[PDB]
Design brief:
Distance between the termini of chain B: 104 Å
Number of strands of chain A: 7
Largest interface: B-C, 14 and 12 residues
Radius of gyration of chain B: 30 Å
Structural class of chain B: alpha/beta
Chains: A alpha/beta (about 250), B alpha/beta (about 240), C mainly alpha (about 55)
Oligomer: part of a larger assembly
Distance between the termini of chain A: 30 Å
Entry title: The structure of the large subunit of the mitoribosome from Neurospora crassa
Organism of A: Neurospora crassa OR74A
PDB class: translation
Bound molecules: potassium ion, magnesium ion
Radius of gyration of chain A: 28 Å
Chain A: 60S ribosomal protein L4, variant
Strand content of chain B: 5-15%
Number of helices of chain B: 8
Order of helices and strands of chain B: HHEHHEEEHEHHH
Order of helices and strands of chain A: EEHHHEHHEHEEHE
Keywords: Neurospora crassa, translating Mitoribosomes, tRNA, mRNA, mL108, translation
Strand order of the largest sheet of chain B: 1-2-4
Chain lengths: ~250, ~240, ~55
RNA sequence: CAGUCGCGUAAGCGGGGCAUAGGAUCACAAGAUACAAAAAGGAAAGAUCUUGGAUUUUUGGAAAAGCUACGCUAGGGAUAA
RNA sequence: UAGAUGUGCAUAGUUAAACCGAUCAUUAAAAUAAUGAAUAGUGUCUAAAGUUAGACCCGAAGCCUGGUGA
RNA sequence: AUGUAUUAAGGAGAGUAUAACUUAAUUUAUGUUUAUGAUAGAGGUUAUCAACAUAUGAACUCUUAGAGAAAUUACUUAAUAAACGAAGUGAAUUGAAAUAUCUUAUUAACUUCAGGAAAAGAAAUCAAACGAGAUUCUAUGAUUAGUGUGAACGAAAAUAGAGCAGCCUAUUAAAAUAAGUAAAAUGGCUUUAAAGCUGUUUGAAUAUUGUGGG
């Protein structure tokens, strides 16, 4: 079929409430390991710093005087002390600060983005939830933390405990790999929760996600809005002349 | 196992790396494919060097010159103009101007000194259109007019075309009038726009004027000629008879 | 302007470059008709071309 | 093949000599071509074709004399005693 | 919200060059008389390369400028 | 190594609680917060068991009055490195497979002057018959136009980005709008023959009511 369904759950209870429809060219693409490779290696090149530096014989300190006479000494002739053959000489072909970045067509990078989403979709590792995706911390703790009654030590020890038993109950913790939460904007509870308990998972903002980030953990828990915005910004090879992008099949039962 | 530990490029994409001077069994050791103690091994030979023999460019010399004043025209064939109208990418009901030709993708994405209509596929072109270009072939003019259309050749420049696409200049297939009897209606037309528009330039050179001044090219200055006048600004049609 | 005491022409207080900047700035705000006579005015440039031509 | 001349009744022959021994580019000079003409009209300086002047004789084409036993460096034993 | 904007390459060939153009050039007028030239590009990665930079590495005698020393 | 922020004179000698720094070489005070901090004791040499912020005493000699063999003399409330900037002067190695033009190269270096930056700067500028609108820095344009016998050298328009600011009543105190000037010949520089710089000898005009430069 040209379109595929996408279930939108309520994050805490994981109740399927709504049903959206996307194109098969969005979440049902074939697995292209060569295209995913070019995108993953393309991001690493741009992340690299590339600032290593070594001195050549033209940059090593000292005078360029001739060390020994050209002949008469019985030893091997020598020029400057900065030669690579000498003790503290310069590395001829040593590292220099340069740009390690490579190029990748916007259309290939957009195909690798939807190919990574399709890899998670066809495997059941893509969970779309309703907007407002945050960890439902207890109201009692939230009331204390704001009040300032709780110390930093206890405040962090509780979040680490609640987040652990919460992820372990959902089978989303360190035992079942990990989970990557993707939201449109930063959320205090979600990001603060996984900043203190990172073994159970992590949280990212849509602007900070990469193709590699969509393949590291065991599942991708993304918001309904972030997914639509993620695919809408990575379909350059498709919208060139549209297809189903968030077509609501079943509305939430208000 | 992990997806990230299973990605690779196609095997045909990978090619052997040759690191020279790294042992005899590599096949490139101890000489790196240079030979034995020659100029090509010690130093470098200039690329233009032939050993001393004079190159042909000297014994024969360079022929001709490169024209630095010729206009670079974008070539458009009727074969392609028909393919666009049928596909629905060019509206034949409206005037086809350079703005619509450039924004259609029929001449590409590069704007040049002008657009010339050529007559490839003139046997199958039967669509009535109203096109305006900088130049046109004698075959294209007949093909356009035979199908029931109109064609006009107007003076353009590389800078005028950019302003047309950018919307800074409005298209017009008529020259700027001359005389104190048109200053009012022209100034009023400018005030009504309420927006700063650049005028399309008119030809200034002898050749450019003569081109758009003759009816063979359907030039937009041909109306300035008399039925017996010549387009040339210097030459005249001689008279026949006994005198 | 020609100085009366000294028969020497004084350069205008606004150069032809600065004249065109005001005309351009006055046209984008709708006060171009409030400026004095200038060979850079959009109507004067156009009138001189239509009346006299090339 | 086209152009247009000669000789020959004609067929036909003629794009020098019975054959084998005369160097370019560049620059310069003389003719033609109507190509381009740095705002525009012209021009200058260029382009194309024809042609001319060379022990450019180290003749695929540098404007060019010696000493070193006060000698120096890189090499060769690829050439000596 | 909408509009515009940002190198380049290719898309048509031909000639010394323009006009011209699926035809163009030579034929001092032209003319199937003759001869030549026509149909997928573009970007990226991997690798090997040409060019310019020290340019695979080591090694002169010497030349110039500024200073030092009786 | 790059980026960001801040700043805009540097060293030496000798002495001293050997973490503590100037013959005072561990000065004297103020405010706030102090374990919910900051990021109900013991301890003045068995010391400095307190951090932040704001003040404060002291701070020698030479470079650096004169002189001299710098850290001395003799006097006295004597005092400013480098790098970077502009102009002036200006090579050679090297490449051309030699070599003079050329290239190396408006380079290195030297001298003078100047500031925290300096320089440049609001068109006698570019464009081309449409228009742009000071200077500076980066990229593209561009192994281009072009120059040169060659080897090689090599723009501008425009575009993009960094910044953006216009004025003479200049936010620091200046013009009665510029004559030995523009320009020419000649000798050179630069350079494409133009424009620009210049020694010598000569030497204009007065504004779009078309005067002057390009
Ligand atoms: K040396
Ligand atoms: K072409
Ligand atoms: K001149
Ligand atoms: Mg080292
Ligand atoms: Mg790589
Ligand atoms: Mg191979
Ligand atoms: Mg071998
Ligand atoms: Mg080889
Ligand atoms: Mg090889
Ligand atoms: Mg060897
Ligand atoms: Mg060899
Ligand atoms: Mg001209
Ligand atoms: Mg020879
Ligand atoms: Mg021979
Ligand atoms: Mg002797
Ligand atoms: Mg003194
Ligand atoms: Mg003293
Ligand atoms: Mg040579
Ligand atoms: Mg050239
Ligand atoms: Mg003046
Ligand atoms: Mg002068
Ligand atoms: Mg001059
Ligand atoms: Mg001048």
């Amino acid at each position: 079929i040209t379109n595929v369904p996408v279930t939108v759950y309520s994050f805490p209870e994981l109740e399927p409430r709504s049903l959206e429809s996307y194109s098969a060219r969005h979440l049902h693409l074939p697995l292209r390991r060569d295209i995913l490779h070019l995108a993953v290696i393309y991001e690493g090149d741009s992340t690299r710093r590339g600032m290593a530096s070594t001195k050549t014989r033209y940059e090593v300190h000292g005078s360029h005087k001739k060390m020994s006479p050209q002949k008469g000494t019985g030893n091997a002739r020598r020029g400057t002390r900065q030669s690579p053959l000498m003790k503290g000489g310069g590395k001829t072909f040593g590292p220099k600060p340069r740009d390690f970045s490579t190029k990748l067509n916007k259309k290939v990078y957009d195909l690798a983005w939807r190919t990574a989403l399709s890899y998670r979709y066809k495997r059941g590792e893509l969970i779309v939830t309703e907007d407002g995706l945050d960890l439902p911390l207890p109201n009692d703790f939230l009331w204390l933390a704001g009040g300032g009654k709780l110390s930093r030590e206890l405040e962090d020890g509780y979040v680490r405990k609640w987040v652990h038993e919460f992820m372990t109950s959902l089978n989303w913790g360190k035992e079942a790999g990990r989970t990557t939460f993707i939201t449109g904007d930063k959320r205090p509870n979600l990001f603060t929760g996984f900043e203190l308990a990172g073994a159970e998972g992590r949280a990212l903002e849509l602007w900070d996600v990469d193709v590699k980030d969509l393949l590291e953990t065991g599942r991708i828990v993304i918001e309904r809005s972030a997914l639509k915005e993620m695919i809408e910004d990575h379909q350059s090879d498709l919208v060139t002349r549209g297809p189903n992008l968030g077509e609501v099949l079943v509305r939430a039962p208000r | 196992a992990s997806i990230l530990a299973s990605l690779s490029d196609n095997r045909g994409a990978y090619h052997k790396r040759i690191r020279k001077g790294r042992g005899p069994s590599s096949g490139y050791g101890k000489t790196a494919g240079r030979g034995t103690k020659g100029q090509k091994a010690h130093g470098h030979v200039k690329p233009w060097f032939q050993g001393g023999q004079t190159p042909l460019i000297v014994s024969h010399g360079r022929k001709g010159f490169v024209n630095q004043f010729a206009a670079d025209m974008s070539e458009l064939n009727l074969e392609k103009l028909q393919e666009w109208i049928e596909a629905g990418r060019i509206d034949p009901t409206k005037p086809i101007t350079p703005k619509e030709i450039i924004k259609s993708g029929i001449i590409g994405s590069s704007i040049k000194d002008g657009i010339k209509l050529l007559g490839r596929g003139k046997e199958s072109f039967k669509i009535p259109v109203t096109i305006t270009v900088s130049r046109a072939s004698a075959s294209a003019i007949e093909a356009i007019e035979a199908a029931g259309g109109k064609i006009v050749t107007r003076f353009y420049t590389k800078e005028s075309l950019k302003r047309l696409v950018e919307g800074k200049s409005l298209h017009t297939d008529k020259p700027l009038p001359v005389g104190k009897e048109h200053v009012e209606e022209i100034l009023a037309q400018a005030r009504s726009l309420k927006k700063k528009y650049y005028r399309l330039p008119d030809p200034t050179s002898r050749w450019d004027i003569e081109y758009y001044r003759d009816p063979a090219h359907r030039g937009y200055l041909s109306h300035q000629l008399a039925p017996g006048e010549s387009p040339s600004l210097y030459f005249k049609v001689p008279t026949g008879g006994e005198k | 302007t020609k100085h009366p005491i000294t028969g020497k022409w004084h350069n205008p207080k606004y150069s032809l470059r600065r004249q065109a900047e005001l005309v351009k700035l006055a046209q984008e705000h709708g006060v171009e008709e409030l400026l004095p006579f200038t060979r850079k005015l959009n109507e004067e440039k156009l009138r001189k071309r239509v009346e006299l031509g090339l």
